[PDB]
Structure 1
């Protein structure tokens, strides 16, 4: 390998490519030709760096200088000012405190201080299209130990000693799944495995981050996986609408065939195991364990009732295993550094760290990977940089539609299995969404309730009929046609539906309604009795009032009223007919003085 004085990494994440990261990479190597330092300066397309708020991200090694909000208007400057002159520019360095101190390392900042990258240890660091960078950074060492010395019996003993439990949302020990696959004996001795990479819940975007960071570690765990249970054939499942990710992953398959890693007679052993891609196109219901089984076989995506388990009957009557990718990622970390390394972090019930993806009104937007046992209060304030613009935090939603809201009374909640279920919510994929006082919490429950109606697979009658029959109760409140006692009609369906569901949506569908009523009962009464939205969001429950002091009385809003509910004389503030307009709101923006407010 040729020695490089300087090394520069570029973020290839989804958020960075949205801003035009491919334009910058094209321009970055253009100036390397011009200034003739191309053979000394290395440009590498790496994965996401966990902070897409500051995207695109340019870090020059060995300096380790962080650049944020770099755009195409300053391409030739950064080549000359740092790669030639050897000095940084203070204006593009991120400054959390604002006092002029520059962090030397990424973990020195408030965003990365509590971020333990274990599964993401090498993701975002290596070149995924370069097989040499991974093997030079301690890669493919796990296979050389297990294919020569370690028995398939012994490896599942390591997992239950590690105490790993699945982060797919179910909270089940992983090593039991492994033993539930090993004991089953098929007629022809044929075994298959599966891989879940299908994320479709809103706010969850961490699933292909390991795919956009490192395809090599994903397939390496697959060879480990087939070695334990004796699998000769494997499938992996992806979505079609990620066009960048689908191309590069198939390229990494070729290098596995080029060295002989994936296939037959793997590393001069008797182990043979191969992969090829399956092309899904973004069905969130396919993420169910047996809905993906009949999706691949080409039938309707019906979720097959359990039992019989996916463990004993699967592809062509042969045993299979179902799990998501990020739980496969720490498996080489188990064998290289010991199971007690995994057990060194976390509480006594479950061990290790957990990976999340944040969203909502937050100052910094990105990924977050916290060791288990951390309070919720620490998450919003010093990790996310606090609430932007001084707003008032009301409730924080986890798991998207699959979970519930966490109000201000539960900031010292230890986020784990037994506490948040006792708080009536589940983590799922780990999406975190923060709400403030600026939006009404009534109709946002209908927003997650919008998701479940348009995605329901249509088999069980509650997840067909009971869903839309539960919308009209909310919207008649949302337009002011409701009556008292309708919220107690909601509580009739509250326990009926959850005990009467087959599809995985049905158990977890009404829980957003369940979470909010036991804290926010009073604000419904404002919607029901006072007929007023506290946030002024519900369109049919809001009215406009002008202020006499600030209004000029010019009459620009009088031209923009389609229902002509405003009238009067010039040079004086006008009169508003509340019942006559359709509450469209076209008049509030047309005033150049901002004289119209929501009541």
Structure 2
């Protein structure tokens, strides 16, 4: 790990790394992602390395380091990032056999070594068997899950050690910055503009316009901030991006800093993510040791420094001004505009704030050109997006599709239908700030324009599927409760109206609802949307308003008839006694504190709905259990 003083020396060392990697024969990859680590992939790796050591395999190593370049290893053990298919982890891949193994168990490691390593055989019992069809798949690409995916941002994910810089070098990285260092800033900025890139953080504001605005400012100091808060629950895109390859976002940050002319930068990560911050710090220290970060990078004179700021909670800290205040060390209360952070942001200096995914795509645009990038997706919104689909679906994981794919095959073809052979009801797009889409609109292609037309927003990119079992009022109540919990309490509309709406929803869902609540809820939502300060309160009533628009009959049934169509609200349960299966035990009469059931022994009993508290004591205490929750 010696310092570098020329651009060509990086490519000179690239050939040495390529030869060192080519000296190997067998490589095994194990998923090091959080979901697979929760299943015990570290124990699997420890068992596998122990068995290899026992079996006389002297050349076994875990991490590819600088000292490893002079060592020829017959068998190499890797630890990559999240491979994308989290449903049946851990994931293991063997080369050059090209066998994709799922559900690897430590006690199966010995058999895997005996057969898959020594005999070049395959075990059908450990391959994926799709219950829908029963077909057996061997290769990863042949899997229907990966068939429709065009991985561009995650090209290096799942095949490169996140803790090794030489592995990243061997894949062709760190060349975009070398090429850009010979060009002017305006050429790079115009290439980015011509690429048609748009912000991936939800707002959709063009990146090229902000970069040009920062370029036109003549100030001694400028800043760049990379946002990786991920405050939306159920979304783990940037988490996996950081855990897979921090060098990509580091390269994008350096390219942006060179383009606009800033010598300092920050990476805002939440401290709740230990693996991500550890990997980021390790990558930064390795890059600084290698000599690519500091003063006079490769003899050009460009200076750049990187800092990591661990977050400490609040969902509202993702907002730009709140993020700047949190970085400075104050309460994350949003400030008033204008001015904007693109004129005076951190410490009253111009700043550029972008998402992790946005900074990840810059080197690809630099290397391949913006015209190639613009040929994918709709003309008004190019590129691709990463979606994390989960919920009541057969297959859950991280998918990447070209931007414009229809929703029906995204839900069904990739997801493998609805689990337990139930009926699809709705999907939530965007998280707490998004709307609810029913089954009638599954034929809608995904892009900013159509989603904005339909009343929803792109959001973080999380997709949740729900079946006919769930109640929509309870779902809206859960989202409203989360919004109430995550508020900051500075302005009147959000702070008061969110709690008022939560109270109204609780009153409706406890059976005490009164006629005229829907109009009051709509008026409150309209006022909150119109008169809020920041973006958290303006998008707060969206889940409630969408549910009211699409599922008004649920609210009407809850209010007027005191009945839950889905049978999920406990306070509105109506137990029914079956005369045929009744033996006149009388346990329900005895155990109920209010005793709404009165009847004769050895004869069917009658439930008085007026005097019942619906606590469930009757059904669970009688051995026959003829009382069913109807």
Pairwise same-fold verdict (TM > 0.5): yes
* Secondary structure class of the residue paired with 1:285: helix
Once the two structures are TM-superposed, the CA of residue 109 in structure 1 deviates from its matched residue by 1.8
Q: How far, CA to CA, are the matches of 1:570 and 1:48 in structure 2?
A: 63
1:165 and 2:185 equivalent? Answer: no
CA distance in structure 1 between the partners assigned to 2:551 and 2:317 by the alignment: 34
Aligned residue in 2 for 1:203: 234
1:255 and 2:286 aligned: yes
| Structure 1 residue 574: Cα displacement | 5.4
Mapping of 1:265-414 within 5 angstroms? 265-414=296-445
Query: Which of the numbers 76, 95, 99 marks the counterpart of 2:110?
Result: 76
User: Given the superposition, is the C-alpha separation of residues 164 and 100 from structure 1 closer, same or farther in structure 2, using an over 3 Å criterion?
Assistant: same
1:316 shift after superposition = 2.2
- State whether structure 2 residue 137 is matched by structure 1 residue 117: no
Partner of 1:448, secondary structure, is helix
CA shift, 1:128, in A, is 1.1
1:560 & 1:200 partners in 2: Cα distance? 46
Measure, in 2, the Cα distance between the counterparts of 1:366 and 1:34.
36
1:241 CA drift (Å): 1.2
**Residue 44 of structure 2 aligns with which residue?**
24
Tell me what 1:482 maps to.
513
Q: Distance in 2 between matches of 1:472 and 1:568?
A: 39
Q: 2:42, 2:471 → 1: CA distance?
A: 39
1:436 paired with 2:470, answer no
SS in 1 for 2:117: helix
**Which one is further off, 576-585 or 563-572?**
563-572
Greater fraction of residues in helix: 2
Partner of 1:183: 216
For residues 596 and 302 of structure 1, what CA distance do their matches in structure 2 show?
A: 53
Listed as ranges, the matches of 1:31-70 within 5 Å are 31-37=51-57, 39=59, 40-70=74-104
Residue 482 (structure 2) pairs with residue 462 (structure 1): no
Q: CA separation of 1:92/1:578 partners in 2, compared to 1, >3 Å: closer, same or farther?
A: farther
Alpha-carbon separation, structure 1, partners of 2:26 and 2:598: 69
Question: Judging changes above 3 Å, is the alpha-carbon distance between structure 1 residues 571 and 14 closer, same or farther for their aligned structure 2 residues?
Answer: farther
Residue 446 (structure 2) aligns with: 415
Cα deviation 1:304-355 (Å, max 9, x = unaligned):
1221111010222211101110111111110111112211101111111111
C-alpha deviations, 1:216-249, integer Å up to 9, x for none? 1111111101101110111111111112222122
Alignment partners' CA distance in 2, 1:138 and 1:594: 67
Contact 2:231 / 2:315 at 8 angstroms: preserved in 1? yes
Distance in 1 (CA, whole Å) between partners of 2:252 and 2:358 is 10
- Equivalent residue number for residue 152 of structure 1: 185
**Corresponding residue of 1:471:** 502
Counterparts of 1:536-547 in structure 2, within 5 Å, are 536-547=567-578
* 2:66 alignment partner in structure 1: none
CA contact (8 A) 1:96 1:110 kept: no
| 3-state DSSP of counterpart to 2:342 | coil
Q: How many residues matched?
A: 596
Which range moves more in the overlay, 543-552 or 420-429? 543-552
Q: Is the 8 A contact 2:270 2:312 kept in 1?
A: yes
Residue 427 (1) aligns with residue 427 (2): no
Is residue 143 from structure 1 mapped to residue 177 from structure 2 by the alignment? yes
Q: Which of the residues 614, 619, 623 maps onto 1:583? A: 614
State the distance in 2 between where 1:533 and 1:100 align. 38
Mapped partners of 1:336, 1:153: distance in 2: 16
- Report deviation, 1:587: 5.3
| TM superposition shift of 1:579 | 4.7
Secondary structure of the structure 2 residue equivalent to 1:195? strand
In 2, Cα distance between equivalents of 1:359 and 1:99: 21
3-state DSSP of counterpart to 1:537: coil
Whole-angstrom distance in 2 between the partners of 1:65 and 1:31: 20
Supply the distance in 2 between the matched residues of 1:31 and 1:593 (Cα, whole angstroms).
Answer: 55
Task: Indicate the SS of the match to 2:241.
Answer: coil
TM norm structure 2: 0.90
Q: Does 1:228 align with 2:259?
A: yes
Contact kept, 8 Å, 1:198 with 1:282, in 2: the verdict is no
Q: 1:492 maps to which residue? A: 523
CA separation in 2, counterparts of 1:37 and 1:566? 75
Q: 1:299 to 1:596 in 2, by over 3 A?
A: same
2:274 alignment counterpart: 243
Rate the CA distance shift 1:193–1:36 in 2: closer, same or farther, 3 A: same
User: 1:488-534, CA deviations, whole angstroms, 9 ceiling, x for partnerless residues?
Assistant: 11121232111101121111001112212222112211111111001
Deviations 1:93-131 (A, max 9, x none): 112266664434323222112211111110121011111
Alpha-carbon separation, structure 2, partners of 1:279 and 1:407: 39
1:532 and 2:552 are equivalent in the alignment: no
**Which residue in the other structure is 2:34 paired with?**
14
Please, which moves more after superposition, 338-347 or 38-47?
38-47
SS in 2 for 1:52: coil
Pairwise CA distance, 1:55: 1.1
Gap change, CA 1:570 and 1:304, over 3 Å in 2:
same
Give unpaired runs (5+ residues) of structure 1. none
Aligned with 2:242: secondary structure? coil
Three-state SS of the structure 2 residue aligned to 1:8 is strand
Task: Give me the whole-angstrom Cα distance separating, in 2, the residues matched to 1:505 and 1:134.
Answer: 38
d(CA) in 2 for partners of 1:31, 1:590:
54
Contact 1:453 1:467 in 2 (8 A): yes
Structure 2, gaps ≥5 residues long: 1-19, 60-73
Selected match of 2:553 from 513, 519, 522: 522
Q: Using the TM superposition, give the Cα deviation of residue 365 of structure 1 relative to its aligned residue in structure 2, in angstroms.
A: 0.7
CA distance in 2, matches of 1:547, 1:555: 14
